[PDB]
Design an enzyme around this catalytic site. Structure first.
Site, PDB file in Angstrom:
ATOM      1  CG  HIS A 135      -2.121  -0.930   0.972  1.00  0.00           C
ATOM      2  ND1 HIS A 135      -2.260  -2.128   1.644  1.00  0.00           N
ATOM      3  CD2 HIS A 135      -3.170  -0.849   0.120  1.00  0.00           C
ATOM      4  CE1 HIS A 135      -3.355  -2.738   1.222  1.00  0.00           C
ATOM      5  NE2 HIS A 135      -3.922  -1.984   0.296  1.00  0.00           N
ATOM      6  CG  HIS A 192      -1.860   0.041  -4.412  1.00  0.00           C
ATOM      7  ND1 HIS A 192      -2.509  -0.879  -5.210  1.00  0.00           N
ATOM      8  CD2 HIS A 192      -2.810   0.582  -3.611  1.00  0.00           C
ATOM      9  CE1 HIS A 192      -3.792  -0.907  -4.888  1.00  0.00           C
ATOM     10  NE2 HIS A 192      -4.001  -0.027  -3.926  1.00  0.00           N
ATOM     11  CG  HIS A 252      -7.175   4.279  -3.655  1.00  0.00           C
ATOM     12  ND1 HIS A 252      -6.092   4.263  -4.506  1.00  0.00           N
ATOM     13  CD2 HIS A 252      -7.297   3.017  -3.178  1.00  0.00           C
ATOM     14  CE1 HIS A 252      -5.573   3.048  -4.534  1.00  0.00           C
ATOM     15  NE2 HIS A 252      -6.293   2.271  -3.741  1.00  0.00           N
ATOM     16  CG  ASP A 253      -4.981   2.298  -0.646  1.00  0.00           C
ATOM     17  OD1 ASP A 253      -5.978   2.229   0.104  1.00  0.00           O
ATOM     18  OD2 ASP A 253      -4.670   1.384  -1.437  1.00  0.00           O
ATOM     19  CG  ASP A 267      -8.179  -0.849  -4.515  1.00  0.00           C
ATOM     20  OD1 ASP A 267      -6.939  -0.662  -4.489  1.00  0.00           O
ATOM     21  OD2 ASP A 267      -8.859  -1.017  -3.482  1.00  0.00           O
ATOM     22  CG  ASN A 269      -2.658  -6.040  -7.794  1.00  0.00           C
ATOM     23  OD1 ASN A 269      -2.481  -6.080  -6.578  1.00  0.00           O
ATOM     24  ND2 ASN A 269      -2.584  -4.908  -8.497  1.00  0.00           N
ATOM     25  CD  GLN A 309      -2.832 -13.673  -4.873  1.00  0.00           C
ATOM     26  OE1 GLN A 309      -3.617 -13.171  -5.677  1.00  0.00           O
ATOM     27  NE2 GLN A 309      -2.408 -13.033  -3.791  1.00  0.00           N
ATOM     28  CG  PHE A 323      -7.707 -12.098  -3.943  1.00  0.00           C
ATOM     29  CD1 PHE A 323      -8.658 -11.347  -3.268  1.00  0.00           C
ATOM     30  CD2 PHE A 323      -6.779 -11.437  -4.733  1.00  0.00           C
ATOM     31  CE1 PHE A 323      -8.697  -9.958  -3.394  1.00  0.00           C
ATOM     32  CE2 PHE A 323      -6.812 -10.051  -4.866  1.00  0.00           C
ATOM     33  CZ  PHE A 323      -7.778  -9.313  -4.187  1.00  0.00           C
TER      34      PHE A 323
HETATM   35  C1  CZK Z   1      -1.932  -9.244  -5.243  1.00  0.00           C
HETATM   36  O1  CZK Z   1      -2.949  -9.739  -4.461  1.00  0.00           O
HETATM   37  C2  CZK Z   1      -3.752  -8.972  -3.686  1.00  0.00           C
HETATM   38  C3  CZK Z   1      -4.015  -7.626  -3.761  1.00  0.00           C
HETATM   39  C4  CZK Z   1      -4.891  -6.979  -2.871  1.00  0.00           C
HETATM   40  C5  CZK Z   1      -5.539  -7.709  -1.880  1.00  0.00           C
HETATM   41  C6  CZK Z   1      -6.484  -7.244  -0.874  1.00  0.00           C
HETATM   42  C7  CZK Z   1      -7.135  -6.028  -0.567  1.00  0.00           C
HETATM   43  C8  CZK Z   1      -7.921  -6.277   0.530  1.00  0.00           C
HETATM   44  N1  CZK Z   1      -7.765  -7.574   0.829  1.00  0.00           N
HETATM   45  C9  CZK Z   1      -8.296  -8.398   1.920  1.00  0.00           C
HETATM   46  C10 CZK Z   1      -9.698  -9.040   2.111  1.00  0.00           C
HETATM   47  O2  CZK Z   1     -10.608  -7.962   2.406  1.00  0.00           O
HETATM   48  C11 CZK Z   1     -10.333  -9.908   0.982  1.00  0.00           C
HETATM   49  N2  CZK Z   1     -10.167 -11.391   1.141  1.00  0.00           N
HETATM   50  C12 CZK Z   1      -9.286 -11.918   0.083  1.00  0.00           C
HETATM   51  C13 CZK Z   1      -9.206 -13.463  -0.047  1.00  0.00           C
HETATM   52  O3  CZK Z   1     -10.249 -14.236   0.562  1.00  0.00           O
HETATM   53  C14 CZK Z   1     -11.503 -13.564   0.533  1.00  0.00           C
HETATM   54  C15 CZK Z   1     -11.456 -12.147   1.174  1.00  0.00           C
HETATM   55  N3  CZK Z   1      -6.898  -8.124   0.005  1.00  0.00           N
HETATM   56  C16 CZK Z   1      -5.268  -9.061  -1.823  1.00  0.00           C
HETATM   57  C17 CZK Z   1      -4.392  -9.702  -2.709  1.00  0.00           C
HETATM   58  O4  CZK Z   1      -4.377 -11.003  -2.344  1.00  0.00           O
HETATM   59  C18 CZK Z   1      -4.157 -11.496  -1.048  1.00  0.00           C
HETATM   60  C19 CZK Z   1      -3.417 -12.813  -1.070  1.00  0.00           C
HETATM   61  C20 CZK Z   1      -3.693 -13.256   0.294  1.00  0.00           C
HETATM   62  C21 CZK Z   1      -5.155 -12.943   0.434  1.00  0.00           C
HETATM   63  C22 CZK Z   1      -5.439 -11.786  -0.465  1.00  0.00           C
HETATM   64 MG    MG Z   2      -7.579   0.948   0.321  1.00  0.00          MG
HETATM   65 ZN    ZN Z   3      -5.892   0.295  -2.834  1.00  0.00          ZN
END
Ligand code: CZK
Ligand code: MG
Ligand code: ZN
Ligand code: CZK
Ligand code: MG
Ligand code: MG
Ligand code: MG
Ligand code: ZN
Lengths: 324, 322
Positions: A71, A75, A111-112, A229, A232, A280, A283
């Site tokens: 973040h 990003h 935004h971040d 957002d 990726n 991933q 996700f």
């Molecule tokens: C490049 O990959 C990512 C870029 C941005 C995020 C990201 C923003 C907010 N979150 C977090 C949770 O609110 C959403 N989760 C996610 C997976 O399960 C379902 C609910 N994650 C995540 C990414 O992946 C992570 C790999 C480990 C888990 C997620």
């Molecule tokens: Mg954010």
């Molecule tokens: Zn963001």
């Protein structure tokens, strides 16, 4: 130099944003915002002094944390540039005013800002000052907005100085509406409404979407920036892998602070027990693909190549997980 | 001395709260909160040390502005005491837990703390640091919560120190839910949902409400405190008249600030062009009666007298239009 050559791809999905970060001396947000403002003729349209813009952008970028692995300003630059590409999607040609375009891009840039590298839930569970200030609701996103706007007050930083009062009020509202929609706790509600918007969508003969009120317009911009957002996994694998590395580093750093506090370690934040491939795929499966297939529906067939890449990347990451 | 005989009406609508403020040395919020906490045995239930309660109450009370005409410690005391009375309504007997009671009362006590005597829209229009902080949304109400909770952290002020972690979490969520619902811009939505609840209300044989879950309970609490916030016109006329005098003084001071800055003067904030009495009647007709008629429906017939007083008071201001 090489930088100008890389910035030639600014209108393309998959811009080598990490290269631009290296090449610009860690100033990708500044250089990419500048390029897009010039490209979209935003300085002339809104009488933005170029010295003012760059001053604001450098201060903004400064307030993204270098030591936060995901973040950060890269990003921010990525979301800005991805939103810039989505804005130009043929299904949305001449739908949005210049001010609406300016609002979407500015929202992406801020935004971040000042993100601490930990989640809303972490901030709430640790009784943080941020959570106390914002009453546990969209804690980070409210704070990003406050900081992003507050930086406009610094010397020679008011990029909106020559907007009319009406324009400023409207931009501020849209920007707030957009950044608050980046709160992941609002994802399922955004998605549920976006699906309904798709079901009933109206188009011209030329095939562009008809959005005839603020509610419809802002809803599309909200989901647009949300997609950017969460873009990726829709990027070429060499880029996606680098984002994945960064988010897991950030997550495990949060996990380490949780373990030190005797707290239950959040999902995917345990460096000892998490699986990257499984993480991933989950996700993509549960968050990213349901969102992007809905966007792709909205703008069909504009986003098919993006959706193809996403589906290829999902197939790729699942390929090394043993399955029945 | 004489304070004790006035405090005997703490269980009654129309408690002489201004009398209490004078007799207590302008500590009506501390006195009334302490009385209610003792009456409801909340210190023992939640193991709140009495010195801790008094210390927090005094600090909280100090953060209501003495130079603000309406949104001051007397209003906070009033809304606390009014909520205390509403909670004891027969239709709500044994409906709420002691934690839910605590949350409503605490929410009432902090619900306007550090109020500056100007509106959300004024704070937004003047690009205040507060509106910047809160992105123009429930600016005052977010701030009241932040302050009310933050003051718990001052020396010997944590009245919730002996709640369990889960209790604190639940109380925190409820208090936030309640105070954010006092934002007047949410009145129509809140009322619309309260009407829905009345249409489908479930009562035991004895007319006691049957709430099924958090959504039900928090909704009743939100509307209860909102009713208490908007209870001035339902009070004994002499109370109502003083409240009207105070809100107009505070409104007028905001209009003076607007006029001075060349801004459009807000509705009912222009001391040079006001119709105080006509405005109270419009207030009752369009906001206060529709709400209280709906609350009266929910707890029928518990609030009949309150409704009758509202209607009498409406006629007072009506017959008083020049
Ligand atoms: C490049 O990959 C990512 C870029 C941005 C995020 C990201 C923003 C907010 N979150 C977090 C949770 O609110 C959403 N989760 C996610 C997976 O399960 C379902 C609910 N994650 C995540 C990414 O992946 C992570 C790999 C480990 C888990 C997620
Ligand atoms: Mg954010
Ligand atoms: Zn963001
Ligand atoms: C005794 O009567 C009242 C008791 C309490 C209120 C009351 C409390 C909080 N508010 C909300 C304002 O702080 C915000 N407003 C938004 C628009 O106008 C300016 C400021 N209002 C009003 C009362 O009456 C007003 C006078 C004419 C009818 C309204
Ligand atoms: Mg209030
Ligand atoms: Mg203890
Ligand atoms: Mg029910
Ligand atoms: Zn109030």
């Amino acid at each position: 130099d090489v930088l100008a050559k890389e910035l030639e791809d600014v209108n393309k999905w998959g811009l080598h944003v990490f290269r631009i970060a290296e090449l610009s001396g860690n100033r990708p947000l500044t250089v990419i915002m500048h390029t897009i403002f010039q490209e979209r003729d935003l300085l002339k349209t809104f009488k933005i002094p170029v010295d003012t813009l760059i001053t604001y952008l450098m201060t903004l970028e400064d307030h993204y944390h270098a030591d936060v692995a995901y973040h950060n300003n890269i990003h921010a630059a990525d979301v800005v540039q991805s939103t810039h590409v989505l804005l130009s999607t043929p299904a949305l040609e001449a739908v949005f005013t210049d001010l609406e375009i300016l609002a979407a891009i500015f929202a992406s840039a801020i935004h971040d800002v000042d993100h601490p590298g930990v989640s809303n839930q972490f901030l709430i569970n640790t009784n943080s000052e941020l959570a106390l200030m914002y009453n546990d609701s969209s804690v980070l996103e409210n704070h990003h907005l406050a900081v992003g706007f507050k930086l406009l007050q610094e010397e020679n930083c008011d990029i909106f100085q020559n907007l009319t009062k009406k324009q400023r009020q409207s931009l501020r509202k849209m920007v707030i509406d957009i950044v608050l929609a980046t709160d992941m706790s609002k994802h399922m509600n955004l998605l549920a409404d976006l699906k309904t918007m798709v079901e009933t969508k109206k188009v011209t003969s030329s095939g562009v979407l008809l959005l005839d009120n603020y509610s419809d317009r802002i809803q599309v911009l909200q989901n647009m920036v949300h997609c950017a957002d969460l873009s990726n996994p829709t990027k070429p694998l060499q880029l996606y892998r680098q984002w994945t590395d960064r988010i897991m580093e950030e997550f495990f750093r949060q996990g380490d602070r949780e373990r030190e506090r005797g707290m239950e370690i959040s999902p995917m934040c345990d460096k000892h027990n998490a699986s990257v491939e499984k993480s991933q795929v989950g996700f993509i499966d549960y968050i990213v693909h349901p969102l992007w297939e809905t966007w792709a529906d909205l703008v069909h067939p504009d986003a098919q190549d993006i959706l193809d890449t996403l589906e290829d990347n999902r197939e790729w990451y699942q390929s090394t997980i043993p399955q029945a």
